[PDB]
Amino acid sequence: MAVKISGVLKDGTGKPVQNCTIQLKARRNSTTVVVNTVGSENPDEAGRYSMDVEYGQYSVILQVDGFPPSHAGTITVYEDSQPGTLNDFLCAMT
Amino acid sequence: MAVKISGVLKDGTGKPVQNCTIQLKARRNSTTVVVNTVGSENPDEAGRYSMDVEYGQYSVILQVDGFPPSHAGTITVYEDSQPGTLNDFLCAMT
Amino acid sequence: MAVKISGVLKDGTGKPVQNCTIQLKARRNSTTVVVNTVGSENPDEAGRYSMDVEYGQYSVILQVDGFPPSHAGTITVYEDSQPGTLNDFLCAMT
Amino acid sequence: MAVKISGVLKDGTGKPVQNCTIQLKARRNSTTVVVNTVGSENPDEAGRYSMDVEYGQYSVILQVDGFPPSHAGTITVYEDSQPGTLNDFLCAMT
Amino acid sequence: MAVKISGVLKDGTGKPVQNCTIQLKARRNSTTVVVNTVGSENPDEAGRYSMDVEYGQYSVILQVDGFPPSHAGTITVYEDSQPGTLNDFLCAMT
Amino acid sequence: MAVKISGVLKDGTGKPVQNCTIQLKARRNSTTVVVNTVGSENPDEAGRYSMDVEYGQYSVILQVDGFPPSHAGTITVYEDSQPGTLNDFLCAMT
Amino acid sequence: MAVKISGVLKDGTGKPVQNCTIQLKARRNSTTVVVNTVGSENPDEAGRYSMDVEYGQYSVILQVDGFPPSHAGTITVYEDSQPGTLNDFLCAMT
Amino acid sequence: MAVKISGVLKDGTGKPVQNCTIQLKARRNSTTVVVNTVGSENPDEAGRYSMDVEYGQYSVILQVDGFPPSHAGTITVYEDSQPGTLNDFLCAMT
Amino acid sequence: MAVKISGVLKDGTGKPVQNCTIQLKARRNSTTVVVNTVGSENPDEAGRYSMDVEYGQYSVILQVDGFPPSHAGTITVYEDSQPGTLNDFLCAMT
Amino acid sequence: MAVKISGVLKDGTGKPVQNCTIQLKARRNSTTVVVNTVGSENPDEAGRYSMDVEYGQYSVILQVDGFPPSHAGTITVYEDSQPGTLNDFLCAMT
Amino acid sequence: MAVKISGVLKDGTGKPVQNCTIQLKARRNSTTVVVNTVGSENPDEAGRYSMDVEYGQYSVILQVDGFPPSHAGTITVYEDSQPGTLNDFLCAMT
Amino acid sequence: MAVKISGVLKDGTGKPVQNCTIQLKARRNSTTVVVNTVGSENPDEAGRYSMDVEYGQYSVILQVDGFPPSHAGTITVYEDSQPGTLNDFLCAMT
């Protein structure tokens, strides 16, 4: 199953960030994802993003049209996670 | 929420600075801001600035047209912070 | 005898991978295959793959148009193996 | 408030110095001036200069089309100083 | 006498491999073969191969216009062997 | 108040020097002269010079059209000084 | 006299070798052959060769069009030697 | 006052030297001559020279558009001397 | 007197060797030959050679258009030698 | 006073020296000749030379058109010296 | 008195040497020959040479058109020597 | 007085040597010759030379447009020598 990861993506001054590109980098083999595979997603102009993420361990990469990739960190989804925003997984007590 | 930061910024000789821009770079990802994201604002011709800032720790950069980028310092916006000028956050005890 | 390897190939965000290529390298020569021989097959537009592999040890290579070759890992198919996705074969205990 | 620094600028032969530029490089964060902000002031043909200086610590630089920028020294304006000339601030007992 | 070697050459995915070339590099002087002599014989489009090997010691080279020559291993033909496939000679207990 | 420094400046053989230039460089800033400020006049065709020198310590440079700059020495005009030739100030006891 | 050396020249797979050349370099001067002298003669398409060789020690070279020269070994034709193929002398006990 | 120095400049064969030039390099600050000042006096075709030197210490340089400047020696015009020739000052017991 | 050295020059295959040239490099002064002198002899198409050698010590160099000069060795002719072939002098027990 | 230096200039084979030039260089400055001053004369076509030299130490140089400058030696002509050839002065006891 | 040296110089194969030249170099000056003087003679078409040499010690050089100059050796013609070939002088006991 | 040196100049093979040039390089100052003065003398086509040498010490150079100048040696002529050939002076007991 795919857990829904949804939210809005704002910069540090309360405005949406445009030209974004969010990438999920698999680091270990899962039941349905092969290692070293990237899954991309492009937010809209208002900053809304929504993805269907398969469980496993991933590295998050954020690219904004003139930014070298910003390694936000590693997220992990098990068979107990509930739908939420991307930021909670980064801030979650791993 | 967001704390409102408003004021006017000048130089030693009591004049507004022109063609400048303030950039806040988030050095630690938060519940609403992802790490390593810059949010910028250009003051008006009178040097007046006004912007809504999300909580967390930020690094402040001033860029003036021609001059090398200046690293003013680091600010921290907590849940108990009250509105004020940008200078007080720089001068706040750490 | 050739075990049937069937499945669908997706990434972290639950989408098929296009322009992909799956290669199997015979690591150790067997009574049916000769060592250092590559066998590859391109999945369809929906990311569905089905191959008939001979038994032995193989190293799996994932090739994507644009990215450098990925080293998924190593599979070892015995005479007693049952049909299934290659994801189970990489994640099988060794 | 701004202390009013006024005077005349003469060289060693008792003559006005032209094509000058007095700049104030702020070295510490103040309640009204951000770090590394320069404010220029060009005196008239008779060597008269007058500036309104916000209190704090400054490094005075005197740039003439000729000798490289001459570091006159560091000046400091508390909230007790009275209006005067820049030479007294340079020569004041720190 | 010439031992007949016959078989079908397949890659890891149970398919014939085309454009190949099997070379037998003789490493030791035999009664009828001089050292460092090669014999090339290309199999058909269905992967069928057959040679008339003279007894002795040989190194097998599999050249497939691609990966460099693949030293599959030394074969040895005694004067008590029976006709078979090349893979058995590779896998034979030396 | 500027001491008057007047006289005639000749060479070893008793002739006036033409195309000359006398430069005073303030090595230490005073209440009326800022540090590292140069003052120069060209003497007349007869080698006669007249100066209104502010109090303080200066370094004297002799510049002739063609020769490299000469370093005559250092003078120090106190408050008890009296008008006289420049040549005495270098030769005064220190 | 001359010992007769007649036979056919096959390769590992039982085929004749074309564009071949046998070279006999005399490594020790004899009653009838001076040192460091070669004699080269071309076998036919069937691979047959016929050589009347004088006594002494020789080094045998196979030169086949395209390949680097091959050093088959060294032969020693004595007075008690009987006619035979070239392979027997190389394979003879030394 | 100026000490008159006159004479005739003859080379080693009792002949006048032409195209000559005598320079007096002041080496110590005097009451009437600034340090590092040169005064030339070109003799006539018959080798006669006559100068009006001031008191002090001088280095005599002899430039003859040829051999490089010849540092003859240092002359001191003590304020008890009487007019003479240049050679007497060189030969004088300093 | 000159001893007659005659014979037929054959290679290891038992054939005449054409395009040859035999040279005798004298290494010590003799009664009739000065040291470091070479005398060439070109055999005919059937390999026959015949020279009239003066007694002494020589080094024989057999040069053919091809392989580099092959120094067969040293020959010595004393006042006891009988006419023969070149090969005997090489093989003679010196 | 001046000593008369006269004579004829000859070489080993009793011949006049043509295109010659005699140079006297004042080694030590005296009451009549300044130091490092050269006085030269050219002998006539028969090699006859005559000059009037002042007292002191001189280094004598012979310059011939084509040959490198020769350093004949050093002469020391005194107050009591008698007229003669420069050969005697060069050969005089020192 | 010049001893006459006459003879014919051959090579190993009993032939005259053409385009030759014999050089005698005097290595020690004598009462009739100055040191380092080279006297040469070209033998005729039949190899016959006839020279007459002065007494002393000489180095004998052979020069042949095509080969680098040979160093034949050393001879010493005394006052008691008898006319003979050049070869005997080389072989004479020393 | 000049000693008369006369003779004939022959090489090692009893023939005159042409194109020669005898040079006398003086080494010490004499009463009539200055150091490092050379006097040439070209002999005629018959090798005859006759020179007049002033007494002293000389080094003899023999330039023959060939071998570089040859140091024949030192010749000393006192006021007792009698006329003779150049070779005797070289061979004379020094």
From Swiss-Prot, chains A, B, C, D, E, F, G, H, I, J, K, L:
It is found in: Virion. Forms tail fibers that play a role in primary attachment of virion to host receptors. Assembles with Tail fiber assembly protein to form fibers attached to virion tail tip. Fibers are about 35nm long and have a thin, uniform diameter. There are presumaby six fibers per virion. They bind in a reversible manner to host molecules, attaching transiently the virion to the host until tail tip interacts with LamB and injects viral DNA into the cell. Interacts with Tail fiber assembly protein. Belongs to the tail fiber family. This is Tail fiber protein. It comes from Escherichia phage lambda (Bacteriophage lambda). The chain holds residues 1 to 94 of 774 of the full protein.
